[PDB]
Amino acid sequence: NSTATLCLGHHAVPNGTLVKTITNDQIEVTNATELVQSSSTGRICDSPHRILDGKNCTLIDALLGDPHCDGFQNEKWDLFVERSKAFSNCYPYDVPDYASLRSLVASSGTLEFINEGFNWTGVTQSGGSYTCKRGSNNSFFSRLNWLYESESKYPVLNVTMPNNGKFDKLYIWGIHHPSTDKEQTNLYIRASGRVTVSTKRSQQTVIPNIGSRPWVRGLSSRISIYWTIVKPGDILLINSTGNLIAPRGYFKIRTGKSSIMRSDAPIGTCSSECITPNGSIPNDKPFQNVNKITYGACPRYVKQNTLKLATGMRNVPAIAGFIENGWEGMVDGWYGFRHQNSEGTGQAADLKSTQAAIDQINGKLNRVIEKTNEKFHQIEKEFSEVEGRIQDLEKYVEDTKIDLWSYNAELLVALENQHTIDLTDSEMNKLFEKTRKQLRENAEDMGNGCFKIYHKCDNACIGSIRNGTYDHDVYRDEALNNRFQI
Amino acid sequence: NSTATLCLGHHAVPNGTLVKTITNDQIEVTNATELVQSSSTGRICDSPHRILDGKNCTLIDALLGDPHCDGFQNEKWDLFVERSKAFSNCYPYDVPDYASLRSLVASSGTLEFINEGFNWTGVTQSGGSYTCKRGSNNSFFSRLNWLYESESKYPVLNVTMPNNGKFDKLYIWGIHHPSTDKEQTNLYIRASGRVTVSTKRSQQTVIPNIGSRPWVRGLSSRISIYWTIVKPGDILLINSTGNLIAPRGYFKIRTGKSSIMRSDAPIGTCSSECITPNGSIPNDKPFQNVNKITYGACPRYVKQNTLKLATGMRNVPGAIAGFIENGWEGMVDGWYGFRHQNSEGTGQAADLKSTQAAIDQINGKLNRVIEKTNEKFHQIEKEFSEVEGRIQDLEKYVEDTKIDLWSYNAELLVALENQHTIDLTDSEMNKLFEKTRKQLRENAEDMGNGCFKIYHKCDNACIGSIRNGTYDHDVYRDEALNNRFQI
Amino acid sequence: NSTATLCLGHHAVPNGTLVKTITNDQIEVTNATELVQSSSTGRICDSPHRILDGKNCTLIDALLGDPHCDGFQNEKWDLFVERSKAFSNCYPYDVPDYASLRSLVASSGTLEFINEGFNWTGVTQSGGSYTCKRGSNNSFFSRLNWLYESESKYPVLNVTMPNNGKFDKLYIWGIHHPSTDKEQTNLYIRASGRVTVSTKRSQQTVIPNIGSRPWVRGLSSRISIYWTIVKPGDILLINSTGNLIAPRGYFKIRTGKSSIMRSDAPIGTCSSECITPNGSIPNDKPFQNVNKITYGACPRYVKQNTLKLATGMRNVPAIAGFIENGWEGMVDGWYGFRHQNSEGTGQAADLKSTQAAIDQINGKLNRVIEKTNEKFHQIEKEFSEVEGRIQDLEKYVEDTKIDLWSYNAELLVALENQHTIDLTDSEMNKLFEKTRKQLRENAEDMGNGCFKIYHKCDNACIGSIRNGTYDHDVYRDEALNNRFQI
């Protein structure tokens, strides 16, 4: 035979993967990678973030100084983990705007407390209760000071505490709501008391409401917790005629990246930057389906449980070229040559075109994988109580956010996959045209991805075509003689 | 040395449509479809959602038990429709945080009420008023209990009601603000009263303010409405020495997909999943411009009133010529096809396979644009009757931010999709041309206008063999090479 | 000698610019434009928006009528600019909902005040203080009326003011908190006063708290500011037994595009639609990095400090064609021809293909640049105090928004640049194919972007190829003779 065949082709695999594009919902590619993190280890890694396990204590109980929370005194955290088993074991209390106090302490990230010498002359300090046992002693919240009558007298208190420092001061104080009038008059001589806590710019007044309350841990009395922030150069001024649960000092309030999370996941010895209530998750992938509640450098939450990014070309199950099919038998390259000549048949991968496609697919992998982590503060996203307007707005904000990011994730994968298909198809065409330019007038396109070479073309000659060193002039006379005969 | 011409082309229409792409603001295509729902029937369909027309009653008036709202007792709804003509015809009242009470009742979706036996020994029950007529006699809110003196005595009430069930209880109660001291002392012996309603985790104390308020429906007194939710295992405790408007029981409070909408649109007999204050709208399209207030499975609201998605190729208005120059208005039975000119005359034939390939891809993207579409969650309020400050600004800002982002998404999506449709329909034309040139081998030359000069005798059957893909170039190669390569 | 060479090419520049695409993080193009506004002039332009410089006055002090703010009476604004140097110099006061009042007045855009004749029979009007000097005399807030005892009597007030107009009325009023019981009884006979301000649909009751507050400008007393909006057809009813700081009328409350901004930037005589606290910025570009706080028609805020949009093709620094190289020596076009023939060598730009590429790039420039400005009202985005739940939600919404727009901006530039690279490559190939179709059998593709023309091809013949009027039949006999020799 005075001719040879040179076919251009691409590889194929027996186990393709379905992905989505702009055109079709399901197209098979040779390989893909998952972009949605859907699994967790189940453990909260104690590195690199400072994790603080609240165990039996809520953050507020550790703030007030519930006795079984004494170990939390002056503690700091990057992430405070509140357990569902936590409980209160001191004086029954409520906190108006509980969520806001819990949030502002959590964000501050410290329970550092500085005692201050308040001048409570005329009243008895450190009132206790059998409902707040600390060891063998009736006691009280470690950071609050229960004031009451001294010598059957409760003089009007007018006590000041200036902030001469360079930091903000967080003062926690309260008001005692006795259950009976006798109880009211025994502790505070008057049948009713008043508290005004003021600064240069603010004032807070609260009236105790004597009366029976539903029984909670052996009492029908209550304490209401309030807070006051005193800026540097401002002054705390306390006026009371009874029922004041006084502060023993202030908490340092700092600005930082700390937060709080509800979780029953065990704390483990490992390292992971992203934390969810289900446990830590890796943050290599750009999206995650584990939990919309996150802490740290985290993939963005989406509704999809899987989004596959194509990392290879379309998978397509005498000799023939790429127009017909792909080559499962080609394992050492993505594109290559098959030939038939006087020496038989052969196959060789084209490394340069293979690397050009691989470099682009790895290129888009870096862009899709590095424009990734959400890294700012998080509102609450789960609610135990029905609250109306503001809770509705929080849910609406989070739902709007998730739908937009789910849309972004869906579009990104479809656009990226369409481009991956296009670029891998383009490399095939570029190799074919490159080969056709080499052959000049010595070959004809058979239309199936193969060239009919109109001269004797041994393996070294075929190698020169794969080489880019084929000299068409050497064979032109023979080839034109074979092509243009009658 | 006879020859023939075979031209490749695509169709064109006289009435094209302008669409947008990544490049141009206006490019004419053969066909397009609208993606923004911009019209409504004006009618609220009563299916498949349970619609409840409030008619003359607000949701709160039906909750409290205004006499002309008695027909709303124990009713449920998926969507409560409040009319602008609604009015109150009972005791003048106000509700601190009205919007929150209205919202949580609306979301619960039921006015189911369970009477309970409270112990009001020592006081007179069921106080009435002439401004709240029921039938012929002075009456009051059906679900509220006006307590006052018994035998010139109002003992300190200390009444309990445990929650021993497995669901939450919503208690509606109130406080009477008399206009004069005589009124205060006649009904409630002391010159001032107190109310404390508490649970294990909450307590609410409110002080009546005796005095005249502006005249409303014949009275200068007021009732202030409050509410309390009691969890299972918790206990309601009521302590009062006067002015208490007592509850007669609790409302069931549920968690579900119910809501409330202000609208004057009539309710109709039809079926439609998306409801807006303008009426029901179809939800086939991905976007809508009718109203940012929606209920049900609805297209997403965008600022654009039209977004046209290309569903055909670019529209482009004696020898024959191919696709390079123009399109073929005379081709009606296909999108791509052939024209030939040979010894037997001229002819035209559509290529069915390549036409379907284009249509299949365009229908493919039509599905993707339409299937990832409906918003399916709860909606905050988006219109406001009073100017309120911080929280209302944030609600408006959230909604404005959302709409701008979805408007951007819709604009980009249509421009990308249209660019791809133009590109794929152009590609099908080029692939059909390349497919033909591969068949002809050395028997033809590209004339540069979308046509081939075939350098051999090429009768109608021979032309048909090229369109059919069965043309054998070897049969004609000798004749063709002789015609091509002469001096 | 009896042949010619015709090469197809595109231009190149020595100083390319790096942009991003879908594939690579850094690809050099001939030209690009910046999409992120990152600089400000430092000046707030007084046009075309009505700027009102508060100078020494906060908006609230101008509202109440602090004497050194008398010049702001009845003033209007599009944007009120509050300075950090502002101060109060009247009676010490607080506003329980300061931020909300400041916001609704700012949004209304006017301090227009309508005096009304209230019936204060039985009390003395226009109470003053030495802490609020107007000229040289004890005075008070210009818009408030300090009522107190007349003839050692303070009768119970029951005063009405109906709204019979067609607009809403904003009433600003207050309550006096005396520091001692002596002040309380001297001004108001009773040891305590009560105020109820009501309408058909609302009622507000407030109790003074007698007692010492921290020293502010020589006094320990306070005024608490409250407000009431009265709709058309509604009625204001004021009931007082002491301590009432009465309104002298109402402020007009309008609905419009006005707002308030904190800034120390100087106000300028210039024109700029977009204002930031750093100063006015141009709004030609679609995005900006200057400040998330904006007023007017503004580019959207993004985290990126630069986003470069390609406005030219990839930059690729005898004769050869585009397969190898770009042509830095081609300055008058984007694509063109280089030839070698019997009359010498030459270069010519192809205007049609250059304009086709430029028109597509200018076309996408309009779409990227014209659909751009945010044109609605803005929440607060910086906070002086630590506040809890609602502030967290405000921060979270703004952070969510900025990340979404930052993502949109990144994806848009990557897609646009990929398409710009692709469309400019396509124009080069289309020009090459157009030339190849013209030449028919008279030339062969040399594989480097050049044609070998197998006939004598003078300057006029080359011109006919570039003009699209080359007649291949004229030269086909000569060309076939040179090509097909054996």
Ligand SMILES: *[C@@H]1O[C@H](CO)[C@@H](O[C@@H]2O[C@H](CO)[C@@H](O[C@@H]3O[C@H](CO)[C@@H](O)[C@H](O)[C@@H]3O)[C@H](O)[C@H]2NC(C)=O)[C@H](O)[C@H]1NC(C)=O
């Ligand atoms: C329910 O709430 C009311 C309101 O706080 C509570 O009222 C208190 O009732 C006691 C009697 O039970 C009053 O004490 C009496 O005052 C007179 C005044 O002279 C005195 O002579 C009597 O010996 C007795 O001390 C008390 O003043 C009153 N407190 C207020 C603020 O009005 C009531 O106790 C609550 N009941 C329950 C069961 O919670």
Ligand SMILES: *[C@@H]1O[C@H](CO)[C@@H](O[C@@H]2O[C@H](CO)[C@@H](O[C@@H]3O[C@H](CO)[C@@H](O)[C@H](O)[C@@H]3O)[C@H](O)[C@H]2NC(C)=O)[C@H](O)[C@H]1NC(C)=O
């Ligand atoms: C006003 O009404 C409430 C409603 O009952 C009264 O509260 C009740 O007070 C008694 C004790 O005074 C509580 O009984 C306790 O029950 C536990 C359960 O085992 C038991 O261990 C204690 O030894 C004691 O028996 C009862 O729980 C409590 N009810 C609620 C709902 O908390 C209140 O005392 C009345 N106050 C008056 C009349 O002043």
Ligand SMILES: *[C@@H]1O[C@H](CO)[C@@H](O[C@@H]2O[C@H](CO)[C@@H](O[C@@H]3O[C@H](CO)[C@@H](O)[C@H](O)[C@@H]3O)[C@H](O)[C@H]2NC(C)=O)[C@H](O)[C@H]1NC(C)=O
């Ligand atoms: C404005 O609101 C005030 C605050 O409630 C109302 O004050 C009430 O005024 C009446 C007399 O004007 C007081 O009643 C009198 O009490 C004395 C006490 O010795 C008695 O001797 C008289 O026979 C008469 O009953 C009433 O106590 C007082 N309310 C309170 C809580 O102190 C006033 O009525 C309102 N004015 C309006 C709406 O015009």
Ligand SMILES: *[C@@H]1O[C@H](CO)[C@@H](O[C@@H]2O[C@H](CO)[C@@H](O[C@@H]3O[C@H](CO)[C@@H](O)[C@H](O)[C@@H]3O)[C@H](O)[C@H]2NC(C)=O)[C@H](O)[C@H]1NC(C)=O
């Ligand atoms: C405190 O002042 C208010 C208002 O200055 C007094 O309320 C007024 O009471 C009169 C008495 O009926 C109301 O008269 C009504 O006039 C309309 C006119 O159309 C008429 O249709 C009614 O049948 C009735 O006669 C008047 O509307 C009402 N004003 C308001 C704003 O509600 C109040 O009586 C004073 N309180 C004391 C204790 O003096």
Ligand SMILES: *[C@@H]1O[C@H](CO)[C@@H](O[C@@H]2O[C@H](CO)[C@@H](O[C@@H]3O[C@H](CO)[C@@H](O)[C@H](O)[C@@H]3O)[C@H](O)[C@H]2NC(C)=O)[C@H](O)[C@H]1NC(C)=O
């Ligand atoms: C502004 O408020 C004052 C006080 O609330 C109103 O003045 C009061 O007007 C009534 C009727 O004009 C007076 O009643 C008269 O009392 C005299 C005895 O002094 C009696 O001889 C008459 O037959 C009549 O009953 C009332 O005394 C008077 N009170 C005061 C303190 O002057 C005044 O009408 C209000 N202004 C307007 C425009 O409504």
Ligand SMILES: *[C@@H]1O[C@H](CO)[C@@H](O[C@@H]2O[C@H](CO)[C@@H](O[C@@H]3O[C@H](CO)[C@@H](O)[C@H](O)[C@@H]3O)[C@H](O)[C@H]2NC(C)=O)[C@H](O)[C@H]1NC(C)=O
């Ligand atoms: C702290 O705040 C309380 C109220 O929030 C202020 O209470 C007031 O205390 C004075 C005593 O300095 C009381 O005045 C006295 O009343 C007796 C009894 O009639 C009288 O005989 C005396 O001549 C003297 O006037 C005043 O009633 C009381 N206020 C109230 C509303 O009851 C206290 O002054 C504040 N202390 C400081 C240092 O700011």
Ligand SMILES: *[C@@H]1O[C@H](CO)[C@@H](O[C@@H]2O[C@H](CO)[C@@H](O[C@@H]3O[C@H](CO)[C@@H](O)[C@H](O)[C@@H]3O)[C@H](O)[C@H]2NC(C)=O)[C@H](O)[C@H]1NC(C)=O
């Ligand atoms: C309740 O306690 C407060 C806080 O200790 C007392 O306020 C203080 O009152 C004194 C008396 O005038 C103020 O002294 C003044 O200081 C200024 C600033 O240098 C000075 O220029 C004056 O000549 C005068 O000496 C002091 O500033 C003030 N402190 C605060 C924080 O307000 C108040 O006196 C007590 N209440 C009663 C009724 O005594």
Ligand SMILES: *[C@@H]1O[C@H](CO)[C@@H](O[C@@H]2O[C@H](CO)[C@@H](O)[C@H](O)[C@H]2NC(C)=O)[C@H](O)[C@H]1NC(C)=O
């Ligand atoms: C399928 O594609 C993935 C992603 O490109 C390949 O996984 C990468 O493999 C290289 C070298 O083996 C690593 O350096 C990358 O970190 C891997 N990336 C990811 C996301 O895993 C994988 O090798 C391909 N072939 C398969 C899975 O058979």
Ligand SMILES: *[C@@H]1O[C@H](CO)[C@@H](O[C@@H]2O[C@H](CO)[C@@H](O)[C@H](O)[C@H]2NC(C)=O)[C@H](O)[C@H]1NC(C)=O
């Ligand atoms: C991670 O944990 C959360 C809750 O801690 C899981 O969310 C619940 O999933 C169950 C699965 O049946 C649902 O029934 C609940 O309605 C979900 N609750 C909430 C509040 O979302 C979540 O499924 C976990 N992630 C997993 C298992 O991948």
Ligand SMILES: *[C@@H]1O[C@H](CO)[C@@H](O[C@@H]2O[C@H](CO)[C@@H](O)[C@H](O)[C@H]2NC(C)=O)[C@H](O)[C@H]1NC(C)=O
């Ligand atoms: C809604 O309320 C209006 C106002 O009361 C009702 O219209 C009145 O209806 C009664 C009874 O038919 C007539 O006697 C009155 O003459 C009507 N007045 C006016 C001004 O129209 C209306 O019927 C109510 N409709 C419903 C469904 O409750």
Ligand SMILES: *[C@@H]1O[C@H](CO)[C@@H](O[C@@H]2O[C@H](CO)[C@@H](O)[C@H](O)[C@H]2NC(C)=O)[C@H](O)[C@H]1NC(C)=O
């Ligand atoms: C549906 O009704 C709404 C109002 O319920 C219309 O929206 C308002 O229409 C008026 C009339 O032009 C405008 O002045 C308002 O500015 C519109 N408000 C908003 C938020 O858009 C809306 O145009 C109606 N749609 C149809 C199709 O009738």
Ligand SMILES: *[C@@H]1O[C@H](CO)[C@@H](O[C@@H]2O[C@H](CO)[C@@H](O)[C@H](O)[C@H]2NC(C)=O)[C@H](O)[C@H]1NC(C)=O
């Ligand atoms: C690089 O591209 C920019 C943008 O296309 C060119 O700047 C434009 O120049 C025209 C004509 O002078 C102006 O009408 C446009 O307003 C300009 N646009 C922008 C965004 O500045 C610039 O000339 C190009 N540079 C080179 C060297 O070609």
Ligand SMILES: *[C@@H]1O[C@H](CO)[C@@H](O[C@@H]2O[C@H](CO)[C@@H](O)[C@H](O)[C@H]2NC(C)=O)[C@H](O)[C@H]1NC(C)=O
């Ligand atoms: C803003 O207020 C400050 C402080 O009152 C002013 O500074 C005073 O300026 C005037 C002349 O400009 C002098 O009479 C005073 O001696 C300055 N210092 C003081 C009073 O401590 C400033 O001028 C005011 N600026 C404006 C624009 O009103």
Ligand SMILES: *[C@@H]1O[C@H](CO)[C@@H](O[C@@H]2O[C@H](CO)[C@@H](O)[C@H](O)[C@H]2NC(C)=O)[C@H](O)[C@H]1NC(C)=O
């Ligand atoms: C515009 O002004 C803001 C604040 O006045 C600048 O942001 C601050 O920049 C400094 C560095 O100069 C940082 O230390 C602060 O932390 C920044 N604060 C905030 C809130 O961002 C901003 O850089 C200015 N931008 C321009 C273009 O002038």
Ligand SMILES: *[C@@H]1O[C@H](CO)[C@@H](O)[C@H](O)[C@H]1NC(C)=O
């Ligand atoms: C197919 O199987 C091989 C080994 O059997 C594996 O390496 C490859 O990842 C698989 N392909 C895909 C797309 O998972």
Ligand SMILES: *[C@@H]1O[C@H](CO)[C@@H](O)[C@H](O)[C@H]1NC(C)=O
């Ligand atoms: C938590 O409380 C339970 C029940 O009182 C107790 O058995 C357990 O030891 C506590 N754990 C810690 C860490 O305090």
